[PDB]
Symmetry: C3
Subunit: 314 residues, 3 copies
């Protein structure tokens, strides 16, 4: 299938500006040029133009409710339109809040989708469980069918319809979960693999297990939402919430590598790359670079090597 | 059970001063503040006042014999007293010599205890095997029942009584063993897991195996003696003998995590944090931080997250 | 058996000068001094004197064809001579091209040998598949029985006789394979373990597997050719083609440690240590030091420790 890159230069999901610069950074590092060189057809849709919503009064504790909700509706419309034409959507963030419009727009055309969430955090805090009014920590709360009506109506998200049930999402890389969020996953029985399970089983067993758990009897589309902070800070330092002890550069490449093998990758998010938080210019190139490597891996690049078929090299 | 932190700001176990500053460093980093927020009752016993022993002439090659012995007798009395009151002892070093009075004081109330020793070194050198007269490399020699009368009588340890047999200690993280020490563990048949065994089996298999080997038929109390240099120098650089190729931040957190699960942790040592050996102020914070992280892990903190029971978060 | 170190201060196999300084760097770091302290007899054969071949015109695209072939014929002669006298050969590079004269000279005395190649690269490019005319990326191509007559006759390699078949070589550490090389290994069915297989299986499973694959029914001599770049750049930075996401210091030590245990190590190469590519003097010592550690591991040094037999330490 072909591919369509969508830039989502948004940052209202948290106080730290800088993330709207993620897609620029990634593009300038040669993302699209490199994607063309694979067996995939690549089209660059460009960057979406977001606009501030006037007098965006905080809803209780939640900041920039309407801005985020508006941004996400617009994104969801773009995603689903591109999806309809039979293409694999690739979204560049931007903060985690853009996960909302991505999975919504995807599910409109594929209600039988499943989400694989690589991150150090669950981002499953509701407007009532949050200690921060930042929406980048609440995307999975606006998407679950079992959490519908468990928290009020935030101004801006009226268009949102819970598109997946807890029984459809797997978490890999958890190491900084809030009490409220950990409750919701214990209660709703969401399948996860925090760092402890990774140490216990190995990345191999992890992929081996997430797969059967989702594609066991019914094979379905895969939506991989990748938060750059899921890997260790020594690999991807330019992010808003670096947390020590994460997945290694090798583990991140393995996750995506297996995802390719299934051939069901239908959507993909590359969130939280904040080019401005690099303690040095080098820390920025390091982060950007692994994000680009992660994206090429999902689209065919293997570490054992690659070569075009129908071409005798000897 | 409740907890009692005991500081042992002692450094006569080696030439490099600075280790006596470990408990200060750790306290200032918020150790006790964070322990209180767990399901345990915490009491800060304060720092022990040690005094130099006048004209502490070197015993053959062993330096500061009496100062160390005295320090440890005093520590053993404070541990056993606190132990008696049904509490979990937590010792902050200080160099490894304080391992002596810690295990002695512990065993006085629990002669059926077992020692889990995380370290890159065995510290089983006797006054006759030692190339250095530093007692921080000999603590396990003063505690073994099979080594009793295998080396003379050092001035100051006449009070010491071999409290464990070689069949009761397991080592994890060995990568810098002297010929004499390796001979003793080979001959005495001490169960260990050097880095090669960890590479071979994985951390899960290591804990899976140290457990059954000790709590196989008879469950007993556990005393975790943690030397900070067991982890890799890129995690805990502020220590006296950093050795390349160690356990990772993730592996250290996994060891401690499984220890919690058994519910048998009865004593705990956090040795060798030397705040003065940080090449930069950042290498000090890093070390300090992981030692604090390791401590909280033993007392309930999990990576998957935590939450208080009897409190509906939804 | 005894050991003989042979320096191969050659660098015409690539543009980056500096590698010819590898053996010096390694000797100055005390390599031979530390080798003596093991259970092996050590003799330092010294450094080979190579000479430029006048008007060494490029063969099609292959640069310095005759210089490389000459150096390698001379090396092959020195290796086989040393091997004839019942000694384990140890070659210090130098660029990867020297792998040619080493395996050739070894096989002259042990046609039944097998090769374990630790590298991020396969170096199996032929004069026709190469995008560069550098001979450091083609050593395995001049050695395979299945590739004989599949590429023309390079001026200088007429003396070479394909000594091993694809069914005799195992690759560990691949993460940067060209299309033509990946074709040759898929076609010829060469056994390998790129980084993904290591992630999937663990180093233990890799060694457990490469061994039976070679020593299954017929045990035979082992020739370990070690490319310093097979480990991660954060361990061995001073090399010509660092590729991120490699084997760790712990994994490298484990490979070599298991090799010792079989007792079949008959030849060994330590290629690609370029002392002039260190961003700082510290990056050089780091690299040099791990190569030295890798060498000592192959000859008896274990992480659990060692001690001389027939010597009561108590
Ligand atoms: Mn995150
Ligand atoms: Mn996230
Ligand atoms: Mn110790
Ligand atoms: Mn130690
Ligand atoms: Mn290489
Ligand atoms: Mn090579």
């Amino acid at each position: 299938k072909p591919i369509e890159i969508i830039g989502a230069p948004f940052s209202k999901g948290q106080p730290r500006g800088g993330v709207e610069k993620g897609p620029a950074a990634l593009r300038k590092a040669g993302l699209v040029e490199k994607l063309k060189e694979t067996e995939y057809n690549v089209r660059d849709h460009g960057d979406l133009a977001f606009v501030d919503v006037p007098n965006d009064s905080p809803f209780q504790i939640v900041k920039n409710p309407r801005s985020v909700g508006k941004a996400n509706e617009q994104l969801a419309a773009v995603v689903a339109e591109t999806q309809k034409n039979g293409t694999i959507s690739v979204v560049l963030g931007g903060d985690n809040s853009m996960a909302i419009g991505s999975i919504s727009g995807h599910a409109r055309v594929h209600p039988d989708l499943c989400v694989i969430w690589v991150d150090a955090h669950t981002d499953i805090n509701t407007p009532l469980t949050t200690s921060s009014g930042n929406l980048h920590g609440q995307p999975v709360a606006f998407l679950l069918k079992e959490l519908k009506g468990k928290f009020p109506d935030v101004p801006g998200f009226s268009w949102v319809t819970p598109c997946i049930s807890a029984k459809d999402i797997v978490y890999i890389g958890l190491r900084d979960v809030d009490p409220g969020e950990h409750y919701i996953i214990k209660t709703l029985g969401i399948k996860y693999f925090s760092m402890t399970e990774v140490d216990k089983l190995g990345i191999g067993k992890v992929m081996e297990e997430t797969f059967s758990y989702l594609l066991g009897r019914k094979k379905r589309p895969i939506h991989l939402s990748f938060d750059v902070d899921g890997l260790d800070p020594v690999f991807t330092p330019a992010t808003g919430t670096p947390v020590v002890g994460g997945l290694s550069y090798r583990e991140g490449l393995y996750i995506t590598e297996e995802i390719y093998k299934t051939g069901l990758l239908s959507g993909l998010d590359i969130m939280e790359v904040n080019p401005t938080l690099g303690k040095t210019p080098e820390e920025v190139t390091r982060t950007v670079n692994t994000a680009v490597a992660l994206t090429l891996s999902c689209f065919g690049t293997k570490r054992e090597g690659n070569h075009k078929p129908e071409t005798d090299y000897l």
